[PDB]
Amino acid sequence: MLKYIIPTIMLMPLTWLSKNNMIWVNSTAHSLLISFTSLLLMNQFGDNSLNFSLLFFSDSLSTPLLILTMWLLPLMLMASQHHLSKENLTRKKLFITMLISLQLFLIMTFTAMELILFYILFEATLVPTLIIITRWGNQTERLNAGLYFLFYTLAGSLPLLVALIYIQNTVGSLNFLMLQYWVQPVHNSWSNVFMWLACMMAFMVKMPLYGLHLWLPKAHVEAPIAGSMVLAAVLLKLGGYGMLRITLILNPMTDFMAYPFIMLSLWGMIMTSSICLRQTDLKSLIAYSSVSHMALVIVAILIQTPWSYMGATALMIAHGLTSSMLFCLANSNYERIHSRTMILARGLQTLLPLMATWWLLASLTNLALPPTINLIGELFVVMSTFSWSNITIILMGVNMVITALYSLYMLIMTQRGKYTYHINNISPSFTRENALMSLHILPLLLLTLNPKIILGPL
Amino acid sequence: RDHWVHVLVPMGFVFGYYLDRKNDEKLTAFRNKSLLYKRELKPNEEVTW
Amino acid sequence: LQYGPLAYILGEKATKKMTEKSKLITVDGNICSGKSKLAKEIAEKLGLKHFPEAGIHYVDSTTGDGKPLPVQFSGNCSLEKFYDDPKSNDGNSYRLQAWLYASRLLQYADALEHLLSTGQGVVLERSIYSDFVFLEAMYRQGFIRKQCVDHYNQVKKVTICEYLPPHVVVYVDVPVPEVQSRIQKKGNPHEMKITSAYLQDIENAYKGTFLPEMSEKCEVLQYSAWEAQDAEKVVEDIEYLKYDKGPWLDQNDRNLHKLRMLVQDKLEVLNYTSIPVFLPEVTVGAHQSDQVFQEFTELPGRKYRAGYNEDVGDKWIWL
Amino acid sequence: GRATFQFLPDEARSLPPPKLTDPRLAFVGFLGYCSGLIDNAIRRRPVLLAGLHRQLLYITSFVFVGYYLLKRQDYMYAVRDHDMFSYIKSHPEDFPEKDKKTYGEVFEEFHPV
Amino acid sequence: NPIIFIIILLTIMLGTIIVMISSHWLLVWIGFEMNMLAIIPIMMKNHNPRATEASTKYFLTQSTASMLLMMAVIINLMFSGQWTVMKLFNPMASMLMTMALAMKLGMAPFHFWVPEVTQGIPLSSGLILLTWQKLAPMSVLYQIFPSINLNLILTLSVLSILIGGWGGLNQTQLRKIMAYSSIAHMGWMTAVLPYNPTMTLLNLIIYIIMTSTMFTMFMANSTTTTLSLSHTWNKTPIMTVLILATLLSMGGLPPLSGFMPKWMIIQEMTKNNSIILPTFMAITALLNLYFYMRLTYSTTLTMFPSTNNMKMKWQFPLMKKMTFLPTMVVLSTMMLPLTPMLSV
Amino acid sequence: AKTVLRQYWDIPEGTECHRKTYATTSIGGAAGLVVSAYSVALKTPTSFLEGVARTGRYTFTAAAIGAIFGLTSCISAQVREKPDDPLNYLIGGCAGGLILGARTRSYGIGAAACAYMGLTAALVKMGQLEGWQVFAEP
Amino acid sequence: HGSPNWLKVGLTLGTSVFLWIYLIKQHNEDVLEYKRRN
Amino acid sequence: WLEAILPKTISLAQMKASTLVTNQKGLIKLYFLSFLITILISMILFNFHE
Amino acid sequence: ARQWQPDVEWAEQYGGAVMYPTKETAHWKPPPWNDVDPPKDTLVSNLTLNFGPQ
């Protein structure tokens, strides 16, 4: 509520209004504080969900999901600091403003009270993200990532507004989710498929199916300095949750056609992870993880029958961190050596000993050792999706193999002798290198102690 | 001067937290429900609304 | 000169700031010939404001206050550099022309307002017209290449449109074969060994090239001698009016023509040269390159990041 | 409505009016308060706070105008309603009174997984 | 000279005020007959060999455009013999009205013109005045509004917003790029027109502002796209955040106001249970956006600052009312469910 | 006018495959003409009086495709089952790819025509079949 | 000796002195009208 | 084969904007003959008279 | 010389023409940078009449 948007918009002139170089520490100081407010009135119910205003129930829903969104902001200025210190302050004042200008809508969205505040705010980004990709790129291939990032996201999300304005005047008012207490079903026709297909395909083009992901590595391979907005674009994607607000209801009873979204993404899950093994560019190698065990949720959501939402929620915020943090490693190791080519960096682990245990705990949580959230987020997937049909144990059982050769080959490539020609790579990871790389593994594993705070209603 | 720039901004909170209290007076319209949910005889429902 | 529509339709200047004392005029000069020795001496008799000739810092000689800033921020080939006639160089010997040209319009753009705001006659030094003499010995001496010669010639057809030519235009008294010693005897350390090519070819190229305006409307005047030098000074003092009075204007061109009533041709020379942002508004570059006259983006394009400091130093508040 | 080509008629007396401290009127001219700061910056002012006589007279203008305009907007949504009920009231033949009944009556589909 | 230029430039709107104020078919002839009489000298001012091979390709293309109308006025003087201004009482009238009136607006066909004039009028000053002639005709179509064959005014619409879209992707001169995509926004407002004809004007005002604030910005010297590259490193960077705060908003994205006409218009065009029409319009204005992107990759990418170009002087143009508009051309979405009930 | 198309429709949708196809095949060609004829106003020429005939050589079509599309359903109609199903009246579309391919060169059309002119056939029937309206009023 | 026009400066101030005055002049009047009418 | 099918849309349209500009160049006669085709073809075609 | 590439040839590819997206047919011309004056100019000398033995 205004408890949140108002201070975080109050942030906005906490920055430029300041002096010279004090700016970074000025806003990083406050931006942490809001996290007390983040929990503050939140983590109330529980049962019979919280709605505190007419057009906002901040998050009740058991999709808390908002606490993270308020984390990643003052993880950027620790992240983004590296080469952004080399241009002017009135531009550096900008890049902190639009970056906030993103953070303000992700608080608006995830609440939205309804469908039609979601959408205009579901499309309300792409103004702030697109401007961070095109400027402050690195290569010159960036200019095409500008377009491809649109012309999909916007391409098929217009058929929403044709459909959601079609519901508003058909049955009552969509003004509120919390009233669905009248919903008739959707039986069949050659019209209703389209309705269901229009109210869906806009979401898929964000969390990729194995088709129409053609943009995802185009934008991430070449993308701002620190992953500065690349950490944010790994929040944006998973935020396609809203399919959890719809497909639960609002055409419940068409599962009839589900199968082309099952067998299409269920054989890609065994697939695009395997086209990730021979990659020669590291920020590509991680970008294809992000498809894979993200695209497993799309076979979690379509199937009804909770024990999937038990396991589908834990995944949106499962790689929400692990897949975040890897883009933070591959950034750092790139500061020192200016190729992103994976081969070139070898013979590390002697020269940066403390950063050894940083790779490991990262690459260990794709392996998903049993105790952490990762498996307890996957093993509620397999338990329901087994009951669907027994044969799902094979493919998604293969996923649990190729992903293990997948991860290690990234670490074990950095255990070798190489002294080779590098006179660079002196800096022994000054604190920010290891400070911002923490505040992930500390908060991540921690939740396993009381992991009832990440769960759906079911 | 006294650095208005600094923590004067957090005061935005209680600024806002008050606004969430502006509405509760116009959302009073139901003191009556069966779920306990009483607003029965007490000087409790009387506060907060 | 007019100021908006508002300062015009009430009162203006057409003939009532021009009493026939207007009479724009210029001179020519060779290399180290007619620079300051004569034309400077004439301001009065007739009370004509004089302008300085050329050089990199003339735009620094406006806007202030006024101390000239260094050669980075005002870029050029830096006179007393190209005197190495760098026909093999970075370059360039053309990019000098641009800033040598970029002011060359600005004087002549700053004169045409002075009349209509006053009516004083104005003597010049080398106006936009007679600069082209260098290009003959600039093009034929090989240091300029092709494609940089036509470029400012593609600028020539654009830049000159509404300009009323000078009246009594005077080619210089010329030494037969002396500017070898004139450049020798006067010092000028870096005006140097540069040979007959840029010596002789210009002189062949003064009259036979500058001829058109010499035969154009406004009556010209010519000497070949040592100089005026107390002999032809008064001659070109009073009797340069006698030719500039009765038999003065041929097609006249400078009448402030048939809109002379302060209309479409009359005030739109003097509304074009106020706020001279539009005067060099077509001088800004072509499609891409020209391979010579350039500045890259950041390399070396930070020169603007230094001269970037608030860009308006003083307006204090409240008003 | 009636009394055509009037900004607002006499009938708007009965409306609150929309007095100040509403977020919009504050917001109105805020978008002007970020307008004034522009007004300097285009010309290389280069103040970023320049004369307060330009840096004000905007904020004065918007909120006055933003105000003087919001007085009629709220009106219009009233005359909209007004003309609806008074039509909804008559022709009750076009406006039925629905009955009361739900549980123990309605069947749904009923399609579980 | 300078007085009359305010006598002429006043008589235009007096030419279009008799259009909106009148009861009487004759006057809506005389009314926009004296524009084609009083527009022409503005084109001229610098007397060049384009304007004069322009306004003569304009002239005889607004000469017949009128002179058909007078043939479709005098038809229903036969039938019913009552002038005034109302449905046209006979089908050969209307079909000879609306598809011979599309010449002044030009719609889907009848534009080999709008690029042949707007290009190469030597006078770019304005050329903002070609936002009047959008506003004279509509102030007929709002009146005649309940007579159209209804299979047409869409068939000139949907063949328009397409044909004006593709027209520009191939263009460089940026007087054309505004010429094109000004047929486009004539696709939305006359596609609506039989359904609830207000929520047209809504698109008509939001249009007069946005195209207005472009030109006033395009006035300093700006002409060709690759003269908008030499812009940010020369004139002023606070200019570039502007030209990126509109050109994007003009194709429109929901946090801006350019999204305001569509968002409302489709509330109208469905609810009438035509849902297979608007997608194709909704989806075609998409590749109407790829002008502006790729226009906007000109100015923020620091492309080869012109040459040594030193403009140390300040400005003295007339920015008049530019210091307002892109706070009303952008930020108005958050404000208004007025536009449907305000002008109505 | 609404005429021809309406006539055909209120004719032999699923049966009486002959008149229908003979109509849908002749109307396609008729439509084809229009475009060919138009090509002379906006595009010029140079092969003199006879030239326009030469030009038409490229438009020596549309009619063929129209014929074929109708023919497919004409041949089908009551075929295996009711060709009235959404997927069926499709079939008339794709043969179209083959048609254009035959008309000119290969690989760079015949699929697309079969593809897209396939995709947009079914909707027509599917359209009135659910009672869709493109141009309406309240 | 700062040099604005000292001609117009204060008009904008003076003008707003009118507007807010006139604004409330219409407002403080019209407020009672609702009750006077209702 | 993912990048052939969709970016085929790119080089599909960008060609049709070469047939709407190139082939229309010039000849004020050539427009004007083509308003005439359009103004008759609206007679025969459809509802326009009905 | 790092952050990105606003390089040599990105300007000229927008250079004034119809800018053939996939194919070239008929370009126009680098329109006149000043007030347009491409075309021909017409001047007749005078009329030659002899006013003769009349």
PDB file of C-alpha atoms in Angstrom, chain A residues 357-426:
ATOM      1  CA  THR A 357      33.206 -21.651  -2.155  1.00  0.00           C
ATOM      2  CA  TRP A 358      31.115 -19.055  -3.969  1.00  0.00           C
ATOM      3  CA  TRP A 359      30.949 -20.918  -7.253  1.00  0.00           C
ATOM      4  CA  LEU A 360      30.350 -24.147  -5.422  1.00  0.00           C
ATOM      5  CA  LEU A 361      27.296 -23.199  -3.384  1.00  0.00           C
ATOM      6  CA  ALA A 362      25.825 -21.689  -6.540  1.00  0.00           C
ATOM      7  CA  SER A 363      26.414 -24.637  -8.831  1.00  0.00           C
ATOM      8  CA  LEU A 364      25.281 -26.908  -6.046  1.00  0.00           C
ATOM      9  CA  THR A 365      21.768 -25.463  -5.998  1.00  0.00           C
ATOM     10  CA  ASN A 366      21.090 -26.397  -9.580  1.00  0.00           C
ATOM     11  CA  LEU A 367      22.108 -29.878  -8.511  1.00  0.00           C
ATOM     12  CA  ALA A 368      19.495 -29.279  -5.817  1.00  0.00           C
ATOM     13  CA  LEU A 369      20.876 -31.120  -2.854  1.00  0.00           C
ATOM     14  CA  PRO A 370      17.860 -32.461  -0.981  1.00  0.00           C
ATOM     15  CA  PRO A 371      17.649 -30.152   2.050  1.00  0.00           C
ATOM     16  CA  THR A 372      17.464 -26.769   0.291  1.00  0.00           C
ATOM     17  CA  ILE A 373      14.335 -25.206  -1.223  1.00  0.00           C
ATOM     18  CA  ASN A 374      15.193 -26.374  -4.718  1.00  0.00           C
ATOM     19  CA  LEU A 375      14.219 -30.039  -4.403  1.00  0.00           C
ATOM     20  CA  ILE A 376      11.419 -29.403  -1.951  1.00  0.00           C
ATOM     21  CA  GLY A 377      10.263 -27.194  -4.773  1.00  0.00           C
ATOM     22  CA  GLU A 378      10.826 -29.900  -7.400  1.00  0.00           C
ATOM     23  CA  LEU A 379       9.511 -32.853  -5.430  1.00  0.00           C
ATOM     24  CA  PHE A 380       6.133 -31.402  -5.142  1.00  0.00           C
ATOM     25  CA  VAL A 381       6.175 -31.107  -8.920  1.00  0.00           C
ATOM     26  CA  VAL A 382       6.996 -34.731  -9.549  1.00  0.00           C
ATOM     27  CA  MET A 383       4.509 -36.021  -7.013  1.00  0.00           C
ATOM     28  CA  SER A 384       1.441 -34.544  -8.689  1.00  0.00           C
ATOM     29  CA  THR A 385       2.715 -34.646 -12.269  1.00  0.00           C
ATOM     30  CA  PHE A 386       3.397 -38.301 -11.734  1.00  0.00           C
ATOM     31  CA  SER A 387      -0.259 -38.955 -10.950  1.00  0.00           C
ATOM     32  CA  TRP A 388      -1.127 -37.244 -14.234  1.00  0.00           C
ATOM     33  CA  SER A 389       0.432 -40.133 -16.070  1.00  0.00           C
ATOM     34  CA  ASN A 390       3.125 -42.453 -14.833  1.00  0.00           C
ATOM     35  CA  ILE A 391       5.344 -41.865 -17.843  1.00  0.00           C
ATOM     36  CA  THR A 392       6.325 -38.302 -16.883  1.00  0.00           C
ATOM     37  CA  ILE A 393       8.935 -39.877 -14.606  1.00  0.00           C
ATOM     38  CA  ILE A 394      11.205 -40.524 -17.585  1.00  0.00           C
ATOM     39  CA  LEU A 395      11.717 -37.194 -19.342  1.00  0.00           C
ATOM     40  CA  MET A 396      11.643 -35.069 -16.223  1.00  0.00           C
ATOM     41  CA  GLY A 397      13.724 -37.851 -14.748  1.00  0.00           C
ATOM     42  CA  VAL A 398      16.235 -37.225 -17.522  1.00  0.00           C
ATOM     43  CA  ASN A 399      16.140 -33.532 -16.706  1.00  0.00           C
ATOM     44  CA  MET A 400      17.658 -34.522 -13.366  1.00  0.00           C
ATOM     45  CA  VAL A 401      20.640 -36.050 -15.160  1.00  0.00           C
ATOM     46  CA  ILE A 402      21.685 -33.707 -17.977  1.00  0.00           C
ATOM     47  CA  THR A 403      21.376 -30.809 -15.541  1.00  0.00           C
ATOM     48  CA  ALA A 404      24.050 -32.331 -13.317  1.00  0.00           C
ATOM     49  CA  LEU A 405      26.605 -32.700 -16.100  1.00  0.00           C
ATOM     50  CA  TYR A 406      25.379 -29.246 -17.062  1.00  0.00           C
ATOM     51  CA  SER A 407      26.357 -27.442 -13.873  1.00  0.00           C
ATOM     52  CA  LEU A 408      29.677 -29.104 -13.045  1.00  0.00           C
ATOM     53  CA  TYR A 409      31.129 -28.517 -16.501  1.00  0.00           C
ATOM     54  CA  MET A 410      30.864 -24.839 -15.665  1.00  0.00           C
ATOM     55  CA  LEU A 411      32.755 -25.099 -12.353  1.00  0.00           C
ATOM     56  CA  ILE A 412      35.231 -27.787 -13.275  1.00  0.00           C
ATOM     57  CA  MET A 413      36.244 -25.680 -16.240  1.00  0.00           C
ATOM     58  CA  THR A 414      37.699 -23.204 -13.712  1.00  0.00           C
ATOM     59  CA  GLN A 415      39.761 -25.873 -11.936  1.00  0.00           C
ATOM     60  CA  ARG A 416      42.877 -26.267 -14.057  1.00  0.00           C
ATOM     61  CA  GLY A 417      46.385 -25.039 -14.071  1.00  0.00           C
ATOM     62  CA  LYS A 418      46.488 -21.783 -16.006  1.00  0.00           C
ATOM     63  CA  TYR A 419      49.151 -19.212 -15.199  1.00  0.00           C
ATOM     64  CA  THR A 420      49.099 -18.651 -18.661  1.00  0.00           C
ATOM     65  CA  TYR A 421      49.756 -15.165 -20.035  1.00  0.00           C
ATOM     66  CA  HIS A 422      47.531 -13.095 -17.732  1.00  0.00           C
ATOM     67  CA  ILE A 423      49.241 -10.287 -15.906  1.00  0.00           C
ATOM     68  CA  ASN A 424      45.739  -9.078 -15.052  1.00  0.00           C
ATOM     69  CA  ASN A 425      43.459 -10.580 -12.393  1.00  0.00           C
ATOM     70  CA  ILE A 426      45.421  -9.200  -9.475  1.00  0.00           C
TER      71      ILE A 426
END
